[PDB]
Amino acid sequence: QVQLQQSGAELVRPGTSVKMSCKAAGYTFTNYWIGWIKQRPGHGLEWIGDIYPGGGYTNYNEKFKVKATLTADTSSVTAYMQLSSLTSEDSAIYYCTREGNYGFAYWGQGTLVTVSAAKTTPPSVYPLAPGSAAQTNSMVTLGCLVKGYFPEPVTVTWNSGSLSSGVHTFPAVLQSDLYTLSSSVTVPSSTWPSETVTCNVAHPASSTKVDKKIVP
Amino acid sequence: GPAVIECWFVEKRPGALLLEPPPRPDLDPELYLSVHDPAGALQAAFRRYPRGAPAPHCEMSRFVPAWLMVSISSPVLSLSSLLRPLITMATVVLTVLTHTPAPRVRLGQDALLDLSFAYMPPTSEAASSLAPGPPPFGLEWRRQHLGKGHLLLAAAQEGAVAFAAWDDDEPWGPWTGNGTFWLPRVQPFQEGTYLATIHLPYLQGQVTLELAVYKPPKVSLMPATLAPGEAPPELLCLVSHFYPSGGLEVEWELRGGPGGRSQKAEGQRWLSALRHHSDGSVSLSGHLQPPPVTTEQHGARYACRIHHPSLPASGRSAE
Amino acid sequence: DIVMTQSPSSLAMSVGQKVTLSCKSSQSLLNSINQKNYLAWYQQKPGQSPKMLVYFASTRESGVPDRFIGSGSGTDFTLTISSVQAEDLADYFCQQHYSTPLTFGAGTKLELKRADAAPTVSIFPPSSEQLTSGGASVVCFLNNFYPKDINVKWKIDGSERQNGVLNSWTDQDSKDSTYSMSSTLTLTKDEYERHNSYTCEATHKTSTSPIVKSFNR
Ligand SMILES: *[C@@H]1O[C@H](CO)[C@@H](O)[C@H](O)[C@H]1NC(C)=O
């Protein structure tokens, strides 16, 4: 069957260039069009352009003629897209699809592109206690706020993952070229502070692990 | 703190549970059991039983993995135990106990059903056990209606969180453990019978609870009108925001009259005014037709007493 | 060139009943020869790649159940789901395949219908270790509320400012189908010691009066 595998995520710096791959295995690659779609959070889907690995090669969009040049390799089944002049608004997910007469219907896995000039820093985590002056009724909510980390992947687990019910982890938000998130958990007052509650945050980019207890 | 507990063995025959040798009288020797609890949960619950409290209901059946299953129910505690054998000696194996079997939570508030458990493995189990320590357990919370139905929590709409732990982890002897159930924003459609089931690789134990919901009403009294000119009796007494539809009885009384401060009013009186609010609660309007006020009734004041299961024994009064 | 307007923004209906999605085009997408409307409907699961459901404004894709019915012509097209289930929670797009450049729609997000639930507001003062290394950040949580329509507003003993107010909304839960929200007041240790009251207000459909949680420094 047909299948489209794309390159991994591309974390680069502004002003540079990025070339991604798209291998097409399962059909005659030089007999169908290969289109590129851009999905940016808050702007939906956008069509960048198509390329036919045969005679009539490329055909670009009006707003994607200077950026995102298209090339193909008929020898080894792969489709490339060379991004250039990467600005902060070029952070999106790029799919490669096998176009047809009625649409695509055959999409790729996807390539996440992120552009920024901040270095790889470890996260700074801080517990979030309701405070001594509070009216703790039945359930008490605790937090584990993680500020000041870059890349993107960070796992947070309460009590080494044994307590996952009622846990709400919020998506990361970029702040001062550093991301930031927080995690909340609701536990009964008969358990806390009677029993210790610990959040374990692991950052696989900087390869760090921090286990911090929540204290009043 | 009773020392002996009467029970019924079903398949009903009389039997006893003994927490030195009592003279076995009108009891078959198979159901006269001397109980020994290494976990010490059932005996502690029986010792902590209120003084003078009525005898709890008890049932004894035969479990199949001998095996006796004892279900002790009371409006104070709920206990389920597994036993293992002229008095037959028995040893407690597994026990699931809750001291909050009838929790009454206000409408809109969060409910916290508590539960505890204890496990004492037999000698044949521990001798053939190469386990690292405490076994992994499962805790299911369901809603029951004469059998089974909807499983709510485990280890699931509208929240319903379950927590369970041992916090002992001592690879020796019996283990104790806690288990809690959280139900957020209790609605009237969530009241009824709940069931907590502890499932260990050995077997299953089950306990039953009855979660009831109440709502105190808002009482108010005021004169009545009819928009006229002249005065046809008519009094009023408004009840607002109540959930227990049953147990409501409106009563009138005259406080401070020429015959004590506890005299029920006379005349016509009717009740039929009720409205369903946009939250499930209801309202009510009581009415009274008192006789003409005499000079001897000067200084007194009328009042409507309201009684409901969501109210204390004295109820609420409004004058 | 061609504009694809999708309607509505995001509807949340219960499972079982039929839902409808509309799509408007700036020009005609119906070909005179071989009378078909060059328009396709795509479905993208949360955090995955989009899959085509209906192409040529009709004729469903193989593997898609018959509940997805595509109709319409000219500039107005419609996609109806007779019996919504749990496997239909996604966002759908309508894309024209008639002229260059190919354009998509804004996308309609499908949620699950529920009863209104007030948010659980809980404010948190800055930590001790945060003050010794950095500044001060106030945390406010809004957990399990329906619908997603919610607005947060801070106040510093009379004053109010949107500077340093970073919020974070969650998606619909895969268990209780509720929404959560967080809010941070990133400040420094300097201007934090010169104010007393810090409150976190909201504005939801459940209560006419906002939920206010404050604390004194
Ligand atoms: C179980 O709860 C009781 C209070 O109800 C507490 O004293 C005890 O430490 C708890 N046990 C565990 C293992 O958490």
Author numbering:
A (entry chain H): 1 to 216
B (entry chain D): 1 to 11, 20 to 27, 33 to 78, 102 to 121, 131 to 200, 211 to 282, 286 to 377
C (entry chain L): 1 to 217
Paper text:
Loading of MHC-I molecules with peptide by the catalytic chaperone tapasin in the peptide loading complex plays a critical role in antigen presentation and immune recognition. Tapasin, a key component of the PLC, is a 48 kDa transmembrane glycoprotein that bridges the TAP transporter and MHC-I to facilitate peptide loading. Mechanistic insight has been hampered by the lack of detailed structural information concerning tapasin–MHC-I. We present here crystal structures of human tapasin complexed with the MHC-I molecule HLA-B*44:05, and with each of two anti-tapasin antibodies. Movements of the membrane proximal Ig-like domains of tapasin, HLA-B*44:05, and β2-microglobulin accompany the transition to a peptide-receptive state. Together this ensemble of crystal structures provides insights into a distinct mechanism of tapasin-mediated peptide exchange.
To obtain additional mechanistic insight into the contribution of tapasin structure to function, we solved complexes of tapasin bound to Fab fragments of two well-characterized anti-tapasin monoclonal antibodies, PaSta144 and PaSta220. Consistent with prior immunoprecipitation data, PaSta1 and PaSta2 clearly bind to distinct sites on tapasin when evaluated with purified proteins by SPR. Both antibodies bind tapasin with KD of 1 to 2 nM. By contrast, PaSta2 contacts tapasin in the palm of the glove where MHC-I binds, interacting with both the N–IgV and the IgC domains at the tapasin hinge that joins the N–IgV domain to IgC. Although PaSta1 interacts with tapasin largely through the CDR3 of its H chain, PaSta2 predominantly exploits its L chain CDR1 for the interaction. Comparison of these five structural models highlights the flexibility of the IgC relative to the N—IgV domain as tapasin interacts with different partners. We compare the various models based on superposition of the N–IgV domains to visualize the potential for movement of the IgC domain, which is displaced by as much as 14.7 Å (for tapasin–B:44:05), 8.9 Å (for tapasin–PaSta1) and 10.9 Å (for tapasin–PaSta2).
